[PDB]
Amino acid sequence: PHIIRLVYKEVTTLTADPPDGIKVFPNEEDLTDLQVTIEGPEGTPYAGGLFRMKLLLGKDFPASPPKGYFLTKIFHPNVGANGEICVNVLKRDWTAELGIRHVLLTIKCLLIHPNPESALNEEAGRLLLENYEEYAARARLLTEIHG
Amino acid sequence: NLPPHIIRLVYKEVTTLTADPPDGIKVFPNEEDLTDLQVTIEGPEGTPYAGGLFRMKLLLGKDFPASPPKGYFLTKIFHPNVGANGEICVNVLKRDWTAELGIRHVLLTIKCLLIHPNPESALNEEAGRLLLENYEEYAARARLLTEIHG
Numbered sequence: 607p608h609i610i611r612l613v614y615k616e617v618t619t620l621t622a623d624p625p626d627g628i629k630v631f632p633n634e635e636d637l638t639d640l641q642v643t644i645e646g647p648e649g650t651p652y653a654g655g656l657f658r659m660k661l662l663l664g665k666d667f668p669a670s671p672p673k674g675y676f677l678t679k680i681f682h683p684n685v686g687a688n689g690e691i692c693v694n695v696l697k698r699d700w701t702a703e704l705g706i707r708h709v710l711l712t713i714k715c716l717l718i719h720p721n722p723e724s725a726l727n728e729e730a731g732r733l734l735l736e737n738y739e740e741y742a743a744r745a746r747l748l749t750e751i752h753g
Numbered sequence: 754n755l756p757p758h759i760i761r762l763v764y765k766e767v768t769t770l771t772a773d774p775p776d777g778i779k780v781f782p783n784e785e786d787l788t789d790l791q792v793t794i795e796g797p798e799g800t801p802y803a804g805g806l807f808r809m810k811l812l813l814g815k816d817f818p819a820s821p822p823k824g825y826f827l828t829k830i831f832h833p834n835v836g837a838n839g840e841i842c843v844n845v846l847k848r849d850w851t852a853e854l855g856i857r858h859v860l861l862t863i864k865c866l867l868i869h870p871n872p873e874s875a876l877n878e879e880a881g882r883l884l885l886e887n888y889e890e891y892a893a894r895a896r897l898l899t900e901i902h903g
């Protein structure tokens with residue numbers, strides 16, 4: 607359909623001029639399964655790590671937001687046990703014109719600034735709230751082990 | 754004014770940032786003062802601010818980088834997290850601030866908040882309350898000021 611072409615143009619431009627600290631590996635055969643690597647941002651517990659993720663464009667894209675999954679093991683209030691990332695504001699504010707680039711930047715933003723109030727991972731969310739420094743130390747350790 | 758040694762470390766960062774800014778963000782360092790940074794954020798597509806140009810100043814602050822920089826919109830705007838004097842309040846940035854987070858990131862989160870308001874931490878209570886209780890009038894107001902001032 608027309609959406610395939612739009613995604614291609616959007617993905618090639620994104621791959622050629624990607625966000626700082628984000629790299630996109632497009633796969634010609636399947637453009638609805640985007641492979642992405644996010645550098646652990648400096649000044650965060652993830653500094654120095656490489657976090658692999660995939661962005662699934664659903665059947666209804668762009669009418670619906672894409673679904674993101676970290677494949678690198680991480681401890682984060684908004685990431686499920688199998689890596690599904692829940693970006694509340696994307697689900698709340700989604701419009702077709704927001705773009706894939708924005709989706710990746712918002713994942714990076716959530717990685718840095720978790721939302722423990724509406725956590726997928728209640729254990730990680732309570733830890734951030736009940737002992738912030740320990741949450742950072744444990745995130746740093748897992749970055750060293752898996753990132 | 755900042756300590757000269759901090760100005761030194763900041764100078765390289767801003768030079769790099771200005772040469773390769775984030776998409777939709779233009780960064781203008783002043784030829785002399787490196788405690789003030791002029792920035793323009795393009796009104797993101799898919800939001801009530803589409804089509805506008807939103808000009809701000811990033812003030813690093815006497816305690817930078819120990820404390821976060823503070824952004825202020827020169828362009829008048831209707832947004833839950835922008836106060837009467839243009840103060841931009843990014844509450845998560847204040848919560849998670851560390852000295853190595855970097856100026857690029859600060860600007861990216863300001864843009865993120867522009868797209869994704871947080872009515873819980875609203876400095877503009879009317880905009881946060883209107884956003885929750887009556888979104889059409891919220892967007893209409895934000896589009897109106899985007900047209901007038903953007």
Ligand SMILES: [Cl-]
Nearest residue numbers: 686688689690
């Ligand atoms: Cl999961």
